Amino acid sequence: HRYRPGTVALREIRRYQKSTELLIRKLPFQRLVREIAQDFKTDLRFQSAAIGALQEASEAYLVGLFEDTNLCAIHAKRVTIMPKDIQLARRIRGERA
Amino acid sequence: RSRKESYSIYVYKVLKQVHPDTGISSKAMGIMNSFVNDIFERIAGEASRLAHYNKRSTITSREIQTAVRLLLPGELAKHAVSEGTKAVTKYTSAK
């Protein structure tokens, strides 16, 4: 039969607050990073441990920025995220002018 | 073979002191080594600023004390100052 919405998401929130393993798996992330660096320089063989470092820092970064964005939306008398929420949080932190 | 550094055995002994029945992972030992690195670096940078805002180039323990209670928050800092001061007394009282 059909389950009622919202439940499975929070259950897997309780599941995904447990294992600190990396969410984005390796190969596509590696291709994206390689396709990026190339724009800055050529022939740059990446240490794989450095790639794991980039992956870790990126994922924790985005998770924390999501936390602030989520609390913005909770303040915004809503439950669902919006892109304007990300703009608000970034405008508070000061990445963009 | 170039000889590399770690602080693993020292804090390893300290861990064995405070918890004899406790194991540890290797990566976490590296994390603690990086931890000591970071705290040491912030302290030393505050020491260099202590020098240049005091126009002096000698480093004594007094500067280390004022550096620690500049960086660390109060209660933790005062306990650490107590530990360091009692160690200063126990060492310099003897040779």
């Binding site: 929130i13 995904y16 969410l23 596509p28 994206l32 995220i81 | -």
Partner: protein, 78 residues
């Protein structure tokens, strides 16, 4: 390219963040901000390796570039 980021990946990012309900334009906005983040990071990382006169970016240089953006990360010898 940038479209190697899957939808359930950013969903899992919401989950470890603990976020419940998801809109639409979130995905492309996420990819954009992630891109600019990695742009600054890997730019000054390759700047470090440029000074290194060597063809491989060190993990050390990655760590120090994170320090240069005030994003100090332990764990990997820093």
């Amino acid at each position: 390219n940038i479209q190697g980021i899957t939808k359930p990946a950013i969903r899992r990012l919401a989950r470890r963040g603990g976020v419940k309900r998801i809109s639409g334009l979130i995905y492309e906005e996420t990819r954009g901000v992630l891109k600019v983040f990695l742009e600054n990071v890997i730019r000054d990382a390759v700047t470090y390796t440029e000074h290194a006169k060597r063809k491989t970016v060190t993990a050390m240089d990655v760590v120090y570039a994170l320090k240069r953006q005030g994003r100090t990360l332990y764990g990997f010898g820093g």
